Amino acid sequence: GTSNRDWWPNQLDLSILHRHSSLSDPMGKDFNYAQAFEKLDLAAVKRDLHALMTTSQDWWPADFGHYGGLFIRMAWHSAGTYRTADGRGGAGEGQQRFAPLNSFPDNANLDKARRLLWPIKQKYGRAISWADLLILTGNVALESMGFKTFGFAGGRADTWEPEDVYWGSEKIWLELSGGPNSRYSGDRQLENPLAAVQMGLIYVNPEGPDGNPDPVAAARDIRDTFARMAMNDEETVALIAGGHTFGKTHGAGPASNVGAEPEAAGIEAQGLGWKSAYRTGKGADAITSGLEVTWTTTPTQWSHNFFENLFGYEWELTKSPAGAHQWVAKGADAVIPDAFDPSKKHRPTMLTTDLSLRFDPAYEKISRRFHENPEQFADAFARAWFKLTHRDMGPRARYLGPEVPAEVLLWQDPIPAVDHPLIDAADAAELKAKVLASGLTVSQLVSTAWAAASTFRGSDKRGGANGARIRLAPQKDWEANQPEQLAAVLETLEAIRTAFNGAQRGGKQVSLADLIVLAGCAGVEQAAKNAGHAVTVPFAPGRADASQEQTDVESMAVLEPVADGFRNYLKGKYRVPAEVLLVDKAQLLTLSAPEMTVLLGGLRVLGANVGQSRHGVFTAREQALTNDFFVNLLDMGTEWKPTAADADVFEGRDRATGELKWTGTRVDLVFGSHSQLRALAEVYGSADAQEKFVRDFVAVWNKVMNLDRFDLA
Amino acid sequence: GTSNRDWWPNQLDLSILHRHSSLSDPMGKDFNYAQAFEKLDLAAVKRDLHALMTTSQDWWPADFGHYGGLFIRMAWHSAGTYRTADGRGGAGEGQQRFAPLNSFPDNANLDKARRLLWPIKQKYGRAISWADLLILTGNVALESMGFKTFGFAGGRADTWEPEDVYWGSEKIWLELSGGPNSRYSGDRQLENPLAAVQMGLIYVNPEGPDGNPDPVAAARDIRDTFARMAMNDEETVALIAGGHTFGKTHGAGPASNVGAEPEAAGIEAQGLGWKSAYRTGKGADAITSGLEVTWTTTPTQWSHNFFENLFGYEWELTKSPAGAHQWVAKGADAVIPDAFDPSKKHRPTMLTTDLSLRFDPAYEKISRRFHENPEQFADAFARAWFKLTHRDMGPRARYLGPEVPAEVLLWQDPIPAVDHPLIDAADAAELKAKVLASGLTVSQLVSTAWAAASTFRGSDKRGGANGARIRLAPQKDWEANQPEQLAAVLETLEAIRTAFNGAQRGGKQVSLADLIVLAGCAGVEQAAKNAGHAVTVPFAPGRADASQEQTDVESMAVLEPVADGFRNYLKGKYRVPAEVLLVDKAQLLTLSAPEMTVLLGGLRVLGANVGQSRHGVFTAREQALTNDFFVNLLDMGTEWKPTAADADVFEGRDRATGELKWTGTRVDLVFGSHSQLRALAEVYGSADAQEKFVRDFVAVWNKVMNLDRFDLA
Ligand code: HEM
Ligand code: HEM
Ligand SMILES: [Cl-]
Ligand SMILES: [Cl-]
Ligand code: NA
Ligand code: NA
């Protein structure tokens, strides 16, 4: 069946904005997962998980009689797809159970892990999501094997279809670099937003870069991919060495024995994959990665044996039974237990990427300190495990249950608690009047609030206007934010704030985070008034102001908009066309297509463009809230052509006289070109639509202002 | 970006069930198009359309000063995609304005026609849909040119995204038959459900079959495609000769001058396509099809000149200026006006497919009758034009506005008016109890109601339980409907009906159509009670009983289910896997994936399978409404293998003992295989889900019972 994608493989895809509809969700429209989880008997679920660790099933027998290592790897892979560049991937949506991640080669035999958890899932039902279950099982695995975790939060609601993530352009699983769709260029530079080295891997290749078994060069890949997953050197060494304290790899025979991944398997496989023709196909004969390495002398117990082995032996290159590159300890005795036969022992072995922890000079120093101070190792691994498994959960207000750690961590982008009465409706009216009397213009107020609120992304629930981080480094210096203009607005608003707060009694005060938002609302109200409409814009107080010391400047950098079609902004020239970047931004903002459309058309006429660009400003009454963008965009009286100087800027001329009427970018004109977007533009550009336009605009403005308001959930 | 469809091009596609979400719709949740249309000033719209017909725009000048022919072609193409096999295509959703139809080669330059209508669309806004406007425009064209139409109904609500239709498997536009993805086999047999001869055409190739200019052979393609669009010989001749009374074709120069179709064009083209480098690119220089034929001596006026020319000349094969095969009148004078130069005239010309109407012996008889009796022609054309443009609109109850024809036509599948009081809630209770006391079983009651209601398809809004056509030919003899079993049920129900109606006063009576549905309701309630659960299944009376004489048996044939996964039924062996046919059925029933899942699981355990097959009956308490299908399907204690006899039937055996527990088809086991459907099955298979399962099952049962109830809209 030939599809629209087949005919026009480069037209824009809007289906990403309409995922996760109430249509595909089996739960009712009023289901609230937080409320269900809060009633779960978490202690009961943990008991069951503890029992499961040593209840071996014959269809995938437990190594050493204990599933703990398999489960830790399942949890680490669940979390391990996370990229800081867009916040996509991670454990927070349980996406390991859907395509493509359920069939990524690095996720081989994790299908067995998840199927082992079905009886507990079934027993507790909607009160524990798959997403939370995958992480909780990893924690219980650690605890059962003697490692005290730092804590656990529930609240990851399940999702019901695949997320649309760009995992790369390669058309071959595991393709090495330099191909027609290479994710590398230059001096081993990984393309943004990717955080893994090959299609179908979590982070790096365990044999070494493109399969070359050089621990030093592997270390560079480890550092880069881990930093693109929000982890620094200390955290990276702690996580790899901590994880490889447990369990083993699987490579008992040639890989050619392993059959189709789950999404390719026959219907009789009932959702499992990688069926192996090698001997019994499981247990002692398992093939997962193709490597055959067991790290410690007690693989089912927390120990300090990883760094004792790493440093206590010299290492020789060898091959696994499947032909993969790995390392064996020179002159060692057979001290490592076999997973199934008590009469067999094995020499210590390591992966290339484990040896990175010793032969990279920066890692070596941390590794040595961990070897000499095992309590430092344990603490670091516990903290890092918590961060790994919660990094995509968003503000601490979303954390549920009795095991949430009290300690506030910097990577959580913490917001102080509010400890004073909030402003009421009369106070809001008084503050809006002050803002409008100060001389701040509609353009300035809308631009500033937009800048503050639109850093939110629903992928990891970072960003938004709570915190007033727009006043701090680095947001106050971002080019998209117009630093000089922004400074002048913030000085004015800070003076309003100070004057209001200083006149109060009874502890009442307004945050700058709330005032920025409130001021934007006043601009929208004033713009409606300019167009002859009496409109009230909803506002919810309660934001607090974070400090600079609570704002990690390096972690904030990934939130910088380098493309923001809602302000007609593009920081540089990119290979991806700007309308694709607009839809990507709309997805991160949680906007539907109708919402994106109404929002952009209104922001254009309110003066929200960076630099006051006239691109897309299709009105003679700027700063008035009208549907003029749509009416003028769709006027067949205007003909459009790309300019000679710049093919991504277009001129709109009167068709009869040739006179220049407007200019526009690709983001502006896509609304008059794409057949679905133009159908939406036509509704808002119709003669019966002015009031609809206004009311839909206020709704989506308010939505954006509230995106991070999990304190009101 | 590599997608799941790239990796697993044969996995099942569920996204067709989640189109049309509230996410993609710009109108509010409460928007009701019928209420908007009912207050449209339809007379004022028509006056504006009438003025438009002779108001030429210089960016697409009007032929002969009149856009009427262009607009008739536009309307005919909007309607002309309809296929009776699945009811897909047609004018009823305005899909001409979306991909791919907006860019079908046969739709070339209808982008200009739609653009001409934007000022009118814009003026009347949400009170006239694009879908309705396209048809209305063709009617006003006809009327302005002196043709009396049969009438017009509004009510086609706009849609906001492309429908997923299988248009064929060819990967090249207009590919000739016989290629690697040929839609023909055997002796020129077109594959179901297609109704056109080449990818990107409406019906046939105007040059002749695969370009061979033989009118006799062309006639065969015309008859077959038009029959597959629900038109017979009389209607086919009336429509082709009627349409070609007006306007002209466009082929002024070589086709290589014409550029990209709209979906491929640059963003500056603002939704238009086919831009032509030939001279002025428009008007006198237009190229659309590549043919250059003008049929009559008055192309802007209704006449009987088409048949006067067809029969009053002999015809010679020639070529257009673009090199296409066409025909010219031997020895003729230049009597046809030129479209732009009043000093030029032309000889009469014809397409190959026009000459079919004289050289096919069956068409020739009708064409001669039309020639000698042009009043017969006019009436046939007007009726056929109404049918063409309304054939996918559904029951007459959906027809809106002041020009609906009063005449009831057989093709409407008409439902008699109800002229008596309806049963009330207490009557419904009395009838349910009588049904249950008669000895009819849950299985019989469920199966019969299912059979009656599930003929509905949302593609053309035909079928459903209204009418009680299950008791008539041909439904009563369809194999899926289990004719002998069905006859026994209907006799019992008819006795109940007769007794209840004979005891009433005041004219109150119950239809058999209502009673069939009510009796199914009683079966579902009794199945719930069998499982220990008291529920009331909603029921809405007001169906009426149609007669045999009001039922076209040949038109009803396309509604026969040859595949119905909800009854585990496949009439024969098909190339398309059965799970794909289940999702197709679910789409036609308007079901989401969750709805499909719950419904199937419940039908399995109620005894709804055809023939009482045990396939998928994963319960030891058949006729009790439980979630046993899901609990048993998902139990990892059971291992599944295809049988030796039949690779599409699977045995579920105890994993430890080998004992046979169940048998299943592909339709049953896809719910334990596909990663999205398994996620759904897991919710209903959970230990907390019994209440949920029952409530969702009752809800989707009731939805199916009401699919054709546009009297309650
Ligand atoms: C450079 C990063 C890493 C690389 C290249 C890597 C590589 C791998 C490979 C190849 C296996 C074998 C899979 C198989 O054949 O069964 C594996 C196993 C495992 N990894 Fe890692 N790993 C990395 C980081 C992590 C991290 C951060 C953790 C957890 C904190 C982790 C925990 C585990 C555990 C517990 C196992 C054993 C699984 C079993 O017992 O079944 N590893 N690792
Ligand atoms: C065998 C069936 C048919 C064939 C192969 C066919 C073919 C065509 C072609 C090739 C053109 C010229 C396109 C262009 O170059 O502009 C066209 C024009 C047109 N056809 Fe048909 N047609 C068929 C049936 C119909 C039917 C059923 C109607 C309406 C009742 C219709 C009404 C029109 C009109 C009015 C035009 C003139 C358009 C203009 O003036 O711009 N045709 N036909
Ligand atoms: Cl994701
Ligand atoms: Cl359709
Ligand atoms: Na994420
Ligand atoms: Na249809």
User: What is the SS3 assignment for B37?
Assistant: helix
Return the structure tokens found at B424.
């009330």
From CA B10, how far away is CA B32, in angstroms rounded? 39
Which of the listed residues B134, B147, B244 should we mutate to test ligand 2's pocket, taking the one with most ligand atoms within 8 A of CB?
Answer: B244
List Cα–Cα distances, B341 to A188, A559, B17, B64, B283, in angstroms: 67, 64, 53, 9, 11
Residue of A113, A114, A99, A158 whose CA lies nearest to B680: A158
From CA A370, how far away is CA A238, in angstroms rounded? 8
List Cα–Cα distances, A395 to A418, A449, A497, A540, in angstroms: 15, 20, 26, 18
Ligand 1 centroid, distance to B686 Cα (angstroms) = 31
The identity of residue B221, as a single letter, is: D
Phi, psi of A108 (to 5 degrees): -60, 130
From CA A626, how far away is CA A636, in angstroms rounded? 20
Question: Which of A58, A263, A673 shows the shortest C-beta gap to B267?
Answer: A673
Is any Cβ of chain A less than 8 angstroms from the Cβ of B98?
Answer: yes
What is the torsion angle, in degrees rounded to the nearest 10, for the CA atoms of residue A695, residue A698, residue A701 and residue A702?
Answer: -110
Establish whether A77 is a catalytic residue: yes
Phi, psi of B106 (to 5 degrees): -65, -15
With b meaning 16 or more CB within 10 Å and e meaning fewer, what string describes A103-131?
bbbbbbbbbbbbbbbbbbbbebbbbbbbb
Query: Can you give the residue ranges of every domain in chain A?
Result: 1-167+373-407, 168-372, 408-564+689-713, 565-688
Tokens 């990276």, located at residue:
A236
Q: Is the C-beta atom of A70 inside 6 A of ligand 1?
A: yes
Determine the atom of ligand 2 nearest the C-alpha atom of B206: 5
B605: CB partners within 8 A, 6+ apart: B617, B618, B619, B621, B622, B623, B624, B625, B626, B628, B629
Nearest ligand, measured from the Cα of B326: 2
Residue B177, min C-alpha distance to chain A (Å): 16
DSSP letter, residue B567: G
Report the residue count for chain A: 713
Ligand 4 centroid, distance to B590 Cα (angstroms) = 13
Are B125 and A17 inside 8 Å of each other by CB?
A: no
**Is B442:B537 a contact under the CB 8 Å cutoff?**
no
Ligand 6 centroid, distance to B561 Cα (angstroms) = 17
List Cα–Cα distances, A601 to A108, A592, A596, A598, B25, in angstroms: 47, 14, 9, 5, 17
Long-range Cβ contacts of B359-362 (<8 Å, 24+ apart): B359/B215, B359/B216, B359/B219, B360/B215, B360/B216, B360/B219, B360/B220, B360/B222, B360/B223, B362/B233
Q: What kind of fold does domain B408-564+689-713 have according to CATH? A: Peroxidase; domain 1 (1.10.520)
Ligand 5 centroid, distance to A273 Cα (angstroms) = 25
Q: Is the C-beta atom of A73 inside 6 A of ligand 1?
A: yes
Question: What residues of chain A lie within 8 A of the CB of B161, using their CB?
Answer: 14, 676
Return the structure tokens found at A159.
């999702």
Question: Which of B59, B98, B265 shows the shortest C-beta gap to A676?
Answer: B98
Tokens 């257009």, located at residue:
B320
From CA B217, how far away is CA B202, in angstroms rounded? 18
What method did the depositors use to determine the structure?
A: X-ray
Are B18 and A23 inside 8 Å of each other by CB?
A: yes
Positive or negative, the Cα torsion across A162, A163, A164, A165?
Answer: negative
Is any Cβ of chain B less than 8 angstroms from the Cβ of A56?
Answer: no
Q: H/E/C letters for each residue in A436-488?
A: HHCCCCHHHHHHHHHHHHCCCECCCCECCCCECHHHCCCHHHCHHHCHHHHHH
From CA A515, how far away is CA A440, in angstroms rounded? 13
| Rg, C-alpha atoms of chain B | 28
Residue of A393, A389, A387 whose CA lies nearest to A87: A393
From CA B664, how far away is CA A100, in angstroms rounded? 27
Q: How many CA atoms lie within 13 A of A444 on its CB side?
A: 17
Q: Do domains B408-564+689-713 and B565-688 have the same CATH topology?
A: no
Angle between helices A352-359 and A305-312 (to 10 degrees): 80
Tokens 């250059």, located at residue:
B292
From CA A83, how far away is CA A224, in angstroms rounded? 11
Is any Cβ of chain A less than 8 angstroms from the Cβ of B343?
Answer: no
Return the structure tokens found at A440.
């701040």
Our CA angle for A473, A475, A478, nearest 5°, is: 115
Residues with CB under 6 A from ligand 2: B 63, 69-70, 72-73, 76, 203-204, 206, 222, 239-240, 242-244, 246-250, 288-289, 291, 353
From CA A682, how far away is CA B53, in angstroms rounded? 22
From CA B649, how far away is CA B658, in angstroms rounded? 17
Cis peptide before A561 (omega within 30 of 0): no
Question: Which of B27, B263, B689 shows the shortest C-beta gap to A125?
Answer: B689
Question: What residues of chain B lie within 8 A of the CB of A25, using their CB?
Answer: 594
Longest dimension (CA), chain A: 93
A555: CB partners within 8 A, 6+ apart: A84, A230, A410, A411, A413
Which stretches of A558-706 are assigned E, i.e. beta strand? 563-564, 569-570, 638-642, 649-654, 660-665
Domain B1-167+373-407 has CATH 2.60.15.10: no
CATH number of B168-372: 1.10.420.10
Nearest ligand, measured from the Cα of B392: 6
Domain A565-688 has CATH 1.10.420.10: yes
Which of the listed residues A53, A64, A71, A76 should we mutate to test ligand 1's pocket, taking the one with most ligand atoms within 8 A of CB?
Answer: A76
Q: How many CA atoms lie within 13 A of A556 on its CB side?
A: 23
Residue of B123, B114, B113, B109 whose CA lies nearest to B48: B123
The identity of residue B312, as a single letter, is: G
Question: What residues of chain A lie within 8 A of the CB of B678, using their CB?
Answer: 271
From CA B393, how far away is CA B79, in angstroms rounded? 11
A665 bridge partner residues: A649
Q: Pick the residue of B4, B7, B117 with the most A CBs within 10 A to test the interface with A by mutation.
A: B7
Is any Cβ of chain B less than 8 angstroms from the Cβ of A17?
Answer: yes
From CA A170, how far away is CA A179, in angstroms rounded? 8
Judged on CB neighbours under 10 Å (0-12, 13-18, 19+), A316 is exposed
What is the torsion angle, in degrees rounded to the nearest 10, for the CA atoms of residue A386, residue A387, residue A390 and residue A396?
Answer: 100
Catalytic residue among A20, A50, A77, A304: A77
Positive or negative, the Cα torsion across A650, A655, A658, A659?
Answer: negative
With b meaning 16 or more CB within 10 Å and e meaning fewer, what string describes B311-332?
eebebeeeebebebbbbbbeeb
Contacts across the A-B interface (CB distance below 8 Å): 242
DSSP letter, residue A661: E
What is the torsion angle, in degrees rounded to the nearest 10, for the CA atoms of residue A466, residue A468, residue A474 and residue A478?
Answer: 90
**Is B135:B156 a contact under the CB 8 Å cutoff?**
yes
Residue A674 annotated as binding? no
Residue of A697, A501, A479, A474 whose CA lies nearest to A599: A697
From CA B376, how far away is CA B238, in angstroms rounded? 9
- Listing DSSP states for B636-672 in one string gives TTEEEEE-SS-TTEEEEEETTT--EEEEEEHHHHGGG
